[PDB]
Amino acid sequence: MPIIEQVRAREILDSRGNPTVEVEVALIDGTFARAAVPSGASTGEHEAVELRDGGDRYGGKGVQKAVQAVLDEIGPAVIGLNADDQRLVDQALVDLDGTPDKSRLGGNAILGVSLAVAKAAADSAELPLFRYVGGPNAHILPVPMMNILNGGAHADTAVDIQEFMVAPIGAPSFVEALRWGAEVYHALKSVLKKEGLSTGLGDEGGFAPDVAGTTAALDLISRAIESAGLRPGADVALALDAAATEFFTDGTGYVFEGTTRTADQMTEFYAGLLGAYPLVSIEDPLSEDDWDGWAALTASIGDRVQIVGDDIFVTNPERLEEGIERGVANALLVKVNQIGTLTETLDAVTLAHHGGYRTMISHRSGETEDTMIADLAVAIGSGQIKTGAPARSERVAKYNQLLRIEEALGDAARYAGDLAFPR
Amino acid sequence: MPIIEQVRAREILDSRGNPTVEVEVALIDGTFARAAVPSGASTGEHEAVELRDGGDRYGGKGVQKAVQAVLDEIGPAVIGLNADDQRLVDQALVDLDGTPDKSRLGGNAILGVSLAVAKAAADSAELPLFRYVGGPNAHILPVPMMNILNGGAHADTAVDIQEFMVAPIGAPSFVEALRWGAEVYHALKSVLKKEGLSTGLGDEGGFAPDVAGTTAALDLISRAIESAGLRPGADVALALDAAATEFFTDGTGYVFEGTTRTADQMTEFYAGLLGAYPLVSIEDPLSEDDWDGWAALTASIGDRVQIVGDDIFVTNPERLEEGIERGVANALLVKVNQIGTLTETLDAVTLAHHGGYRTMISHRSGETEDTMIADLAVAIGSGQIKTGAPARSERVAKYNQLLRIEEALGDAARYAGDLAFPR
Amino acid sequence: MPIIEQVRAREILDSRGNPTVEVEVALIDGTFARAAVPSGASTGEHEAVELRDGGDRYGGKGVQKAVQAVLDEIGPAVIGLNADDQRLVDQALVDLDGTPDKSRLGGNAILGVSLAVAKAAADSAELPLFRYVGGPNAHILPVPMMNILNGGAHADTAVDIQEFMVAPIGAPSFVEALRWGAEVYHALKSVLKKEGLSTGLGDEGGFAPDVAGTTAALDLISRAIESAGLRPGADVALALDAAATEFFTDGTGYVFEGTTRTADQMTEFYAGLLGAYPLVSIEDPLSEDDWDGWAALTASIGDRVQIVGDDIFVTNPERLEEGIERGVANALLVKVNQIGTLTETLDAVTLAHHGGYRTMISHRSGETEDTMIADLAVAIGSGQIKTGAPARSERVAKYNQLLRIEEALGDAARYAGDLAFPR
Amino acid sequence: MPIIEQVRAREILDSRGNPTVEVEVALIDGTFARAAVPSGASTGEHEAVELRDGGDRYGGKGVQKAVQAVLDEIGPAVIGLNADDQRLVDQALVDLDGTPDKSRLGGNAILGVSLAVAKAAADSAELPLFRYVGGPNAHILPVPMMNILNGGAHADTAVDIQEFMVAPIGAPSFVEALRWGAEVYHALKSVLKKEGLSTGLGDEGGFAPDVAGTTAALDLISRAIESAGLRPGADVALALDAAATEFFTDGTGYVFEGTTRTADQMTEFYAGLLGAYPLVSIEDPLSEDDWDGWAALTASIGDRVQIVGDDIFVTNPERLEEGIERGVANALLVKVNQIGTLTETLDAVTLAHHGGYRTMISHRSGETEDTMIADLAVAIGSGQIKTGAPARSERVAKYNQLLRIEEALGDAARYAGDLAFPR
Ligand SMILES: O=C(O)[C@@H](CO)OP(=O)(O)O
Ligand SMILES: O=C(O)[C@@H](CO)OP(=O)(O)O
Ligand SMILES: O=C(O)[C@@H](CO)OP(=O)(O)O
Ligand SMILES: O=C(O)[C@@H](CO)OP(=O)(O)O
Ligand SMILES: [Mg+2]
Ligand SMILES: [Mg+2]
Ligand SMILES: [Mg+2]
Ligand SMILES: [Mg+2]
C-alpha cells in the first residue's frame, strides 16, 4: 500500500549556495523518496510565493519556516493518503495552505511534498519516474536547449539578454545531441579565449563574457558551432531567453542595449535577428504583463519562430488560458516551482497541449542535484528541455538522467530533433 | 518482474454474435490479464486488416487464424519482454507482422496482445488501467455521447445517418450525466411508442424506428429531452455520426435522403441543422477520401461545431497529419482497432492534442464486455466518449466502469461538462 | 483467512438502462470480488422484493436505498464472518432483514452480498467459481436455450409469447452449440429481412418482429434453422417461455391470441404445437397460482415435453415443494434474484434434483456484464441455461464465460446435448 | 499450485487384519494427503476388481502388486496434473488401466490415488473435505444407519440377514442422534446378556448372537430401543441389509430361514415385516441380477419403504441407469471402492439424485481409520450414512468426524432426521 507514513524536510543549498527545501516521503510499504526545490533569480511577479526566513542568517534566505511548515502542518495533513492519488494530495496541500499564491506554507514547502509524493508513488509502482508520470507511451527525448552564454540576472555583466542557447535539432539521438552541445560549448570556450573574453561561468554554466550586445554573442556562438564542425541551423540552431521583464519599466518600456524601446521596436529588433540568424525560439521577448505587446509580437513573427511565455504565464493555467484567448505566444515554459504542485503543472501542460501550444520543461537558475525535470520532459513528451550549459552538475545531472532514460527505452526511444520546432 | 511468460487467445463472440479475438497474457510475477477486440460494421477502407477465416463456419467470420497467429507466432515473439515496455512490445508486433495494414497476423490478433499487455502491466504496477496509461493526473470523466436512435449500417431501416446522439454537457458530474442520458433514453422510448414507431434496438442499443429523415429523428430526440425535464442544448446537446462514406459513391457524390448531393450541398444541409438544433458535434459528415469536401466544410462551419474525423483518419497518425496540414476536421475519433496497437493509438492521440484537435474515445458497433475504452478516455483526458445508448451491456459496462473510476478518484474527479465543446 | 473485512455497494445500470445494485466484498487476505444483481420485467407476484427509491430520479427506479442498506446495515452485520460459510452469511442476511420477502433490506441488497461473498470465497480458495460452488465434479456444459425472437413484456409488439428459443441439443460440444445458435440467429435475421419484418432487438437480444402469432414465429425460426444447414429437432430443437401470468386475468382466464381461454384450452393449444413442432420445453404455459391448470397440463403433456415452472415456483423451496407434491411441472427455472440468496437458490436446486425435476439456470430480462450464472449452470450440472440470444453482451458475456469454462475443463468437459431433455 | 509432485503407496491392514492399500499424494505447494481403501466381504460380482497377490503371504490377500502399480505406473502417469482437475486425474487412471473392471492396476490402486488427490486438492484450497467436494452449500448431517446386530458374511452364525440397523430419525441433531444410537447399542448388550446370548462383536461392531431368525433379532432391537427410553419408529426406526446375493442360488432362488423361496415369497416376507415393524429401509432384499424380482418387489412395497440397491448397482452409473429404467429400487448404496474413482462415484450419485433415487454413503465390512465417507455424506447431502455400530473405531472414527463437521458448520448444520425417509 503506497500510503504516506512520514514526511520530513530539511534545509539544503542550491547551485548558488542559497538555502532551499528538500522533502523526504516514506510509505507504509517501505518506499522512501526525496525531492528538492529550485529557486529563480529573474522571478516573475505572479510566481507562487517562496517562503524565506529573513533576518541575518543566510542573508535572509533561510527556509527553516518552510521546513517547519512541512514537519508541523503538511506532514500531519497528508499521512494516511495514498501517494498514487497525486491530485487528492495536491488539493489537500492547496486547501491546507488556503491562499491563492501559496503564501501561508510556501510554494517551496508545498512543491517539495508534491514532488516527493510523485517519486514515492513511482518507486512503489516500480516504474521509472518518466513512465509513472507519462504512462507507457512516454518515449520522446527532448532537444536540449543549452544556455552556453549567460547574461542578465545570471551574471554580473552589462549583457541585457539572460540566455543564449544552442539547440542540436539535427542530431539523430539524444546521446549525439548532448555530445554536439558539449563540443560547441568547449569550442565557444576556445573562441572566447582567442578573443580575450572571460570564460568565467554564470549561474547556468554558460560563459559570462561582457560582450557588446546580442549580435556579438550570437556571432561568437555561430563561430563555436562551425568550429565544432556542425552547421548553424540544420545541426545546431539558436534560441534566446530575453527575460524582458528584467529590463522593463512599469508603464514605460524596455531599457535595452542603451535605449528605452517600445514593444513594437523590440518586435522590430527580434524580427531583424530572425532575418540574420537560425533562431528557432525566443522566450519572454516582452514583459510579464505587456499583453498588447505580446499579441502584436506573436501576430508579427509567431508563424516564423517559437515564442515562449515564461514570466507572462508562470506555469499557471489561469494566465496561460488568458494568453491562448489573446493569441499571445505559441509555447509555455514549464516550471514546477512557478505554480507549486505537480498537478497544477500538469494542468498547465494539458491546457497548452490541447490549445496547440508547445511546452518546454525548465530548470531555475538556482538548481539542485535533483533530476526530476529530465523524467518530466520525457513524461509529457514536450520534445524540448531547458536545463543549462553542459557544465555545472546541477545542469549536467539532468542530461546524464536523459542518457539513462534513452538507454532504458532502447529501440522505443525517439529524439524529438527538428520535429520540436515545425516553423 | 512484469516479464511476459504466456500469451493465449481464443475465439469469443461480440455483441452481434460474430466471432472476435480474446487474448490472455500471464507475467512471471503471476499477473494475468484479458483483453477482447471489437469489430466495426461501417469500416473505413484504410482500417488495419481484420483477419477472418472465410468458408462456411460463422458465415466466413471465424477468427481461428488470428487465434493461431497469437499462439504460434506472437506468443513466441514477445515472451521474455517487459509488459511495461508497451512501445517495444508494440514495435515487435508490428515488425513480426511486417505489413503496413497488419494484413499478415491481423490487426485483431495484434491489438488483442497490445491491449492484454497494457492491462497486465497496469495490474503488475497495482495501478488502475486509467492511471497506468494516463499517469497520476488522469482525472477527467468524459461527456458520454450516447447514440439513442440508430440508423445506417447499425439497423435495417432506410435512415441514412448512422448515429443520433445526446450529450449531457450540463451535468455537474459523470454519475448525474449518465442518469440524464438514461432518463432521456427512457423518455424517447415513450415518445416513440406514442408515435407508433419501433422501439426495437439497433446494434448500439439505440431505438431503430424507420423515421422519415434527419430532422424527424432530431425532433423526436428534442421531445424526449424536454419530456425528461432537461433543456436541449444547455443540459443535453445533440451530436451525429453521418458515416457519409456509407452513402458516398466513388468520384460521384452523396446519395442522401432521396438525392445525389455534392460535398457543398451536404455542407449546406449540415449548416441548416446547426441553425435549427443544439448540435455540438458532427462525425464523418463527408466521405473518407473527400479531402476537398472536408476542407471546405471545416472552413464553413468548423468555428461553430466540432467536426470529427472517423473513416477519414482511422486513428492513423499519417492520415491525421494530412488532415491537420489541410485544415480538415477539428477532432479525431479514437478507435484502437482502426490502427491495431495501443502505442499507435496514443501516437495519433498525441498528434491530435499537440495539433489543437479534440479527441473522442470510441467503441465499435460490434463490442464486447471489455471496458478498456472507459479507462482509456480518462487516461487521455479526451473529455468525450462514444460508447452507445445506455442499453445493451456491451455499452452499459463502459458507463458502469466510468462510475467506478469517478468513485475511485473522489474529490479529484472532474466532469468534462460543456468544457468538452468550446464552440 | 477468507474473513470479510469490507462490503461496499454502488448503483450501476442494467442492460435496459435501469439502476441496479453492485456489491464489492474484500477479505483480510486481500481477496476482492464484485457481483451485480439482475432485474426482471415479467416479475412473479411471489418474487423476493426488489427495493426501489421511487420519486423522480431514474423514473422511481433508483437503488440508493438498497446501496445504503448494504453500507450501513449489512456490511456491519457480516464483517468478521468467514466468506466460506456461505450458509451462515446467507442466514445472517435473512435474519438481519427479518421479513419473509426480504422487503426491509431488499432481495437486491441481500443477493448482491450473497453473490460477492461466494465469489470472494472462490477467489480465496483459488478455485474457478464453477468449481468452488459445484466441487471437483462440476463438468457439464449446458445446452444454451437461446431466445432469438422476443415478445410479451420484452418488446413493444402484440406478440403474447415472451420467448421463442432454439436449443442446439445435437451439437458435439458447447463451443459448436454456441456456433449453431449464432448461425441460426444470423439466418433468422436474413429470413426476417426477406419477409419485410423488423430486425430491431428486444430486451434479450432476440428480433422483435410483430408477427401474427405463435406458429408464424415458430415457422420463421424453423426456416432459419434449415437455412443454417441444421435439422430442426435433431440438431436445433425449439422451446418457449409463454410467461402466461402476463396474459392471465385473476380468477378469469388467459387472454391469448385474440380470445379468453381456459387452462384446458391453453393445454389444447400447447398439445397442438407439440404435434407440429420439435418442442423440448415450455416454461410458464399457465399462470403463477393456477395450480389446478398446471396439474392437468402436466398430466396431459408432461410425459412428452419439459414443463418449466418460473413464476409458479420463483426459485422458492416452499413453492417448488407444493409443485412436487401436486405433480406440477417437471423442471424449475433457477433465478438467484427471485429468492435473494445463493443458499436459498441451492436449496431449491437440491429440492428439484432430489424430486427428479430438471433445472434451468436463468438470466433476467434486465442483465449486467456479470457472468456468475455461467459458472452456476456448470456447478449444479443443470445441463440447461437460459441467458438470451447470442446478441447483446449482457447475454453473450455468459456464453463467452461458458467457452472459457469448457476450455479450462479440457477432456473433462461434457456437453449436456440431447441428454438434457430425455422426453 | 496444487500440481501433483509425488504419489507413494504402502500396504496397511484393515479392521479385519487383511492387507489393503494406503496412498500418499504430495503437491508442489507442500500439500501432503493420505487415503486408505476399504474391502468388502459380501462383494458383488460386478464390483471393480480388487488386486490381490495370492500365494502364502497374508493367506493370498497381500496388496504389494497394487502398491507397485501405484509407485511404477500411476505415479508417473499423474505427476504434473493439477490435483483440482479430479475428473482429468480420474480419466487418466481409467485410461492408464484400460480395462472395464480396473482389473489391470486394481480398483484398490486406482481408488487410493483418486481419494488422496481429492484430499490434497481440498487441503491446498484450505477447505474441509466436505466443503471442497460438496461446495459451500454442503450442510446436511446424515441419519446414521447403525448396524448393531451383525449376521451373514460379517459373523460365524446361522443368521441369514447381514445387517440389523437402527436409525435415530427423530433426533434434533447429529450429536443427539449419535448418542441415541450409542444408548440403544449399550441397551441391546444388556438385553442380550439377560437372554444368555453372545455379546461377541461381528465385523461391523454389532453383537453377533446366534438368534433364531429375522423377527427374533428385530424383537431384541425393539426392546433395546424402549429400554433406552426411546420410541421405536418415531425416535429410532429399523433398517436391514439382507445381502440376498449371499443366500441366492443362480437361476434357482433364495435359501432363507430353512427353505428355498422365490423373489415373490421373499417379497411376501418383507411385506410382513413392514406390517409388524417400523422399518424405513431394506437393502438388497433380492440378488444382484434378479432384475424381475426387484421390479415386482419395488412395485409391491416401494411406496411404503426405502429399497436400497447395493450389489445390484455396485455404485455403477450403467447398472443404476438400468435400474432407474426398470423401476428397480428407490435408493443407491454409495461405495467408492465398488467403482474405483471419486468421479465415477459422483456420476452415480448425480444419476440417482437426478432420477429421484435417494443415496446412502456406505463403509465396507473391512474398514480403516480413514474418515473420508463422513465428509462425502455431508458433501452430497445424502442425509443417510451406513458406517457401523457405534463400536470399533473403524466405525466410530466416521461418527467422530461427523461430530466435528456438525460443530464446524455451527448454525448452518441441519440434521436430515425423518426428512431422509419420506415414506
Ligand atoms: O527566466 C526568468 O525571467 C526567471 C523567471 O522565469 O527565472 P530564472 O532565474 O530561473 O531563469
Ligand atoms: O462509424 C463508421 O463509419 C464505422 C467506421 O468508423 O464503424 P462502426 O460500425 O464501429 O461505427
Ligand atoms: O419470465 C417472466 O415471467 C419474468 C418472471 O419470471 O422474468 P423476466 O423479465 O426476467 O423474463
Ligand atoms: O453388503 C454386501 O453384500 C457386500 C457387498 O455390497 O459388502 P460388505 O461386506 O462391505 O457389506
Ligand atoms: Mg526565463
Ligand atoms: Mg463512425
Ligand atoms: Mg419466465
Ligand atoms: Mg450390502
DSSP for D68-133 reads HHIIIIIHHHHTTSBTT-HHHHHHHHHHHH-SSS-TTT-HHHHHHHHHHHHHHHHHHTT--HHHHH
Please give, rounded to a whole number of angstroms, the shortest distance from the CA of A161 to a CA of chain B: 30
Q: What angle do CA D161, D164, D170 make, to 5 degrees?
A: 150
C-alpha cell at D318: 450403467
Residues 6+ apart with CB under 8 A from C192: C198, C199, C207, C209, C220
Same domain, D270 and D369: yes
DSSP for A260-324 reads EE-HHHHHHHHHHHHHHS-EEEEE-SS-TT-HHHHHHHHHHHTTTSEEEESTTTTT-HHHHHHHH
C-alpha cell at D345: 462415484
Which of C312, C321, C259, C307 has its CA nearest to residue C290? C312
Annotated binding site of A: 154, 162-163, 241, 283, 310, 335, 362-365, 386
Residues spanned by the domain of D242: 127-423
CB of D294 within 8 A of CB of D286? yes
Residue D310 CB less than 6 A away from ligand 4:
yes
Residues 6+ apart with CB under 8 A from A144: A167, A168, A174, A177, A178, A181, A385, A387, A390, A399, A402
A200: left (phi over 0), alpha (psi -120 to 50) or beta: beta
Q: Using CB atoms, which residue from C88, C353, C411 is nearest to D354? A: C353
CA atoms within 13 Å, Cβ hemisphere of D351: 22
Residues 6+ apart with CB under 8 A from B161: B151, B152, B214, B217, B240, B241, B242, B243
Interface test with C, best of B123, B178, B392 (most C CBs within 10 A): B392
Q: What angle do CA B382, B386, B387 make, to 5 degrees?
A: 125
Residue with cell 419395488: D298
3-state secondary structure of A109: helix
Peptide-bond breaks in chain A following residues (C–N over 2.5 A): none
> How many Cβ atoms sit within 10 Å of the Cβ of residue C92?
17
- Any idea how long chain A is? 423
CB of B144 within 8 A of CB of B170? no
3-state secondary structure of C224: helix
Same domain, A34 and A142: no
What secondary structure, in 3-state letters, does C350-378 show?
Answer: HHHHHCCCEEEEECCCECCCCCHHHHHHH
Contacts of A410 in chain B (CB under 8 A): 85, 88
DSSP for D96-108 reads HH-SSS-TTT-HH
Same domain, B226 and B345: yes
Distance CA D135, CA D129 (A): 10
Distance CA A285, CA A265 (A): 11
Residue with cell 465390512: D365
C-alpha cell at B293: 469536401
First and final C-alpha spacing in chain C? 47
Residues 6+ apart with CB under 8 A from D263: D253, D254, D286, D290, D292, D293, D294, D296, D297
Strand partners, D25: D7, D33
Residue with cell 441407469: D321
Distance CA A23, CA A21 (A): 7
Q: What is the C-alpha radius of gyration for chain C, rounded to an integer number of angstroms? A: 21
Q: Using CB atoms, which residue from C17, C56, C404 is nearest to B391? A: C17
Last residue of a domain, one of C126, C155, C185: C126
Q: What angle do CA B306, B308, B312 make, to 5 degrees?
A: 150
3-state secondary structure of D38: coil
> From residue A107, how far is each of A99, A113, B350, D148 by CA, in Å?
11, 10, 30, 88
Q: What is the C-alpha radius of gyration for chain B, rounded to an integer number of angstroms? A: 21
Contacts of A137 in chain B (CB under 8 A): 86-87, 133, 342-343, 346-347, 350
First and final C-alpha spacing in chain A? 47
Q: At what angle do helices B291-301 and B317-326 cross, to 10 degrees?
A: 50
Residue A243 CB less than 6 A away from ligand 1:
yes
Pinpoint the alpha helices (H) of D228-365.
Answer: 263-276, 291-301, 317-326, 336-339, 342-354
What is the dihedral sign for C-alpha D288, D293, D297, D299?
positive
Q: Using CB atoms, which residue from C127, C137, C347 is nearest to D346? A: C137
> From residue A396, how far is each of A12, A185, A384, A389, B234 by CA, in Å?
19, 13, 16, 8, 53
Which of B275, B292, B282, B147 has its CA nearest to residue B221? B147
Distance CA A164, CA A151 (A): 8
C-alpha cell at B410: 473522489
* Burial of A259: CB neighbours in 10 Å, binned 0-12, 13-18, 19+: exposed
Smallest-distance ligand from the CA of A50: 1
Q: In this structure, what DSSP letter does residue A392 have?
A: S
C-alpha cell at A362: 525548465
Answer whether D86 sits within 8 Å of C132, measured CB to CB: no
Q: Using CB atoms, which residue from B91, B121, B381 is nearest to A350? A: B381
Same domain, C201 and C330: yes
C-alpha cell at A411: 529501440
Residue D394 CB less than 6 A away from ligand 4:
no
Strand partners, D307: D282
Please give, rounded to a whole number of angstroms, the shortest distance from the CA of A223 to a CA of chain B: 35
For residue B104, the CA-to-ligand 6 centroid distance in Å is 25
Largest Cα–Cα separation, chain D: 61
CB of A301 within 8 A of CB of A334? no
Contacts of B156 in chain C (CB under 8 A): 189, 193, 198-199
Asked whether at least 3 C-beta pairs link D and B within 8 Å, the reply is no
Type of residue numbered A20: T
Q: Count Cβ–Cβ pairs < 8 Å, chain C vs chain D.
A: 92
> From residue A276, how far is each of A146, A148, A150, A222, A238 by CA, in Å?
20, 20, 21, 11, 11
Q: Which atom of ligand 2 is nearest to the CA of B203?
A: 9
Residues 6+ apart with CB under 8 A from C211: C149, C157, C159, C197, C217, C220
Distance CA D39, CA D44 (A): 12
Distance CA C180, CA C190 (A): 15
C-alpha cell at B220: 423526436
Q: What angle do CA D43, D49, D50 make, to 5 degrees?
A: 80
Last residue of a domain, one of D101, D126, D151: D126
3-state secondary structure of A62: coil
Q: Which atom of ligand 2 is nearest to the CA of B335?
A: 6
Type of residue numbered A351: L
Residue ranges with CB less than 5 Å from ion ligand 7: C 241, 243, 310
Q: What is the C-alpha radius of gyration for chain A, rounded to an integer number of angstroms? A: 21
Distance CA B105, CA B109 (A): 6
CB of D124 within 8 A of CB of D113? no
Asked whether at least 3 C-beta pairs link A and B within 8 Å, the reply is yes
Residues 6+ apart with CB under 8 A from A275: none
Type of residue numbered A411: D
Please give, rounded to a whole number of angstroms, the shortest distance from the CA of D126 to a CA of chain C: 7
C-alpha cell at D373: 465417507
Residues 6+ apart with CB under 8 A from B196: none
CA B166 to chain centre: 15
Contacts of D353 in chain C (CB under 8 A): 353-354
Domain count, chain B: 2
Which of D241, D240, D267 has its CA nearest to residue D253? D267
CB of C351 within 8 A of CB of C324? yes
Distance CA D114, CA D77 (A): 13
Residues 6+ apart with CB under 8 A from B329: B294, B298, B302, B307, B308, B309, B312, B313, B323, B357
What is the dihedral sign for C-alpha B181, B187, B190, B195?
negative
C316: left (phi over 0), alpha (psi -120 to 50) or beta: beta
Q: What is the resolution of this structure in A?
A: 2.2
Same domain, C231 and C272: yes
Q: What is the C-alpha radius of gyration for chain D, rounded to an integer number of angstroms? A: 21
First and final C-alpha spacing in chain B? 47
3-state secondary structure of D55: coil
Distance CA B301, CA B351 (A): 23
CB of B61 within 8 A of CB of B173? no
Chains that touch B (3 or more CB pairs under 8 A): A, C
Distance CA D310, CA D294 (A): 12
What secondary structure, in 3-state letters, does chain B show?
Answer: CCEEEEEEEEEEECCCCCEEEEEEEEECCCCEEEEECCECCCCCCCCCCCCCCCCCHHHHCCCHHHHHHHHHHHHHHHCCCECCCHHHHHHHHHHHHCCCCCCCCCHHHHHHHHHHHHHHHHHHCCCCHHHHHHCCCCCEECEEEEEEEECHHHCCCCCCCCEEEEECCCCCCHHHHHHHHHHHHHHHHHHHHHCCCCCCECCCCCECCCCCCHHHHHHHHHHHHHHCCCCECCCEEEEEECCHHHHEECCCEEECCCCEECHHHHHHHHHHHHHHCCEEEEECCCCCCCHHHHHHHHHHHCCCCEEEECCCCCCCHHHHHHHHHHCCCCEEEECHHHHCCHHHHHHHHHHHHHCCCEEEEECCCECCCCCHHHHHHHHHCCCEEECCCCCCHHHHHHHHHHHHHHHHHHHHCEECHHHHCCC
Same domain, A95 and A30: yes
Q: Using CB atoms, which residue from A131, A346, A381 is nearest to B84? A: A131
For residue D222, the CA-to-ligand 8 centroid distance in Å is 22
3-state secondary structure of A32: strand
Distance CA C288, CA C312 (A): 4
Q: In this structure, what DSSP letter does residue C72 have?
A: I
Please name the helix (run of DSSP H) or strand (run of DSSP E) that holds residue C406, with its range, or none: helix C393-409
Strand partners, B366: B39
C-alpha cell at C114: 450473497
Distance CA B164, CA B169 (A): 16
DSSP for D185-203 reads HHHHHHHHHHTT----B-T
Give the β-pairing of B384-386 and B358-362.
Answer: parallel
Residues 6+ apart with CB under 8 A from C372: C35, C115, C119, C129, C336
> How many Cβ atoms sit within 10 Å of the Cβ of residue B272?
12
Smallest-distance ligand from the CA of C360: 7
Q: Which atom of ligand 3 is nearest to the CA of C243?
A: 3
D240: left (phi over 0), alpha (psi -120 to 50) or beta: beta
Distance CA D335, CA D341 (A): 10
Which of D314, D341, D245 has its CA nearest to residue D46? D314
For residue B200, the CA-to-ligand 3 centroid distance in Å is 19
Same domain, C161 and C22: no
Which of B401, B409, B376, B139 has its CA nearest to residue C34? B401
Residue D42 CB less than 6 A away from ligand 4:
yes
The set of protein residues with a Cβ atom below 6 angstroms from ligand 2 is: B 40-44, 153, 162, 241, 243, 245, 284, 310-311, 364-365
CA A88 to chain centre: 25
| Ligand 3 pocket mutation pick from C203, C338, C364 by most atoms within 8 angstroms of CB | C364
Pinpoint the alpha helices (H) of D195-262.
Answer: 214-227
Distance CA B11, CA C38 (A): 27
Asked whether at least 3 C-beta pairs link A and C within 8 Å, the reply is no
Q: Which atom of ligand 3 is nearest to the CA of C162?
A: 1
CA B83 to chain centre: 25
Same domain, A151 and A254: yes
3-state secondary structure of C287: coil
Number of H helices, E strands in chain C: 14, 16
Please give, rounded to a whole number of angstroms, the shortest distance from the CA of C372 to a CA of chain D: 15
Please name the helix (run of DSSP H) or strand (run of DSSP E) that holds residue A344, with its range, or none: helix A342-354
Residue with cell 433490506: C105
Same domain, A171 and A279: yes
Same domain, A291 and A310: yes
For residue A304, the CA-to-ligand 3 centroid distance in Å is 69
* Burial of C369: CB neighbours in 10 Å, binned 0-12, 13-18, 19+: buried
Distance CA C104, CA C49 (A): 9
Which of A265, A263, A274 has its CA nearest to residue A239? A274
Distance CA B413, CA B311 (A): 32
Distance CA D346, CA B393 (A): 37
Contacts of A133 in chain B (CB under 8 A): 135-137
Distance CA A202, CA A154 (A): 6
> From residue B75, how far is each of B7, B101, B109, C27, C120 by CA, in Å?
5, 20, 11, 35, 31
CB of C90 within 8 A of CB of C347? no
Same domain, A122 and A19: yes
Same domain, A201 and A258: yes
Last residue of a domain, one of B83, B111, B126: B126
Residue with cell 432362488: D253
Which of D283, D388, D395 has its CA nearest to residue D333? D283
Q: Which atom of ligand 4 is nearest to the CA of D204?
A: 11
Please give, rounded to a whole number of angstroms, the shortest distance from the CA of B191 to a CA of chain C: 13
Please name the helix (run of DSSP H) or strand (run of DSSP E) that holds residue C146, with its range, or none: strand C143-150
Measured between CA atoms, the residue of chain B closest to residue C389 is B17
CB burial string D231-261: b at 16+ within 10 A, e below? ebbebbbbbbbbbbbbbbeeeebbebbeeeb
For residue C243, the CA-to-ligand 7 centroid distance in Å is 5
Contacts of B208 in chain C (CB under 8 A): 200
CB of D88 within 8 A of CB of C410? yes
CA C173 to chain centre: 22
Please name the helix (run of DSSP H) or strand (run of DSSP E) that holds residue C344, with its range, or none: helix C342-354
SS3 content of chain D, % helix, strand, coil (to 5): 45, 20, 40
> From residue B280, how far is each of A280, A359, B284, B304 by CA, in Å?
37, 29, 14, 8
Give the β-pairing of B260-261 and B253-255.
Answer: antiparallel
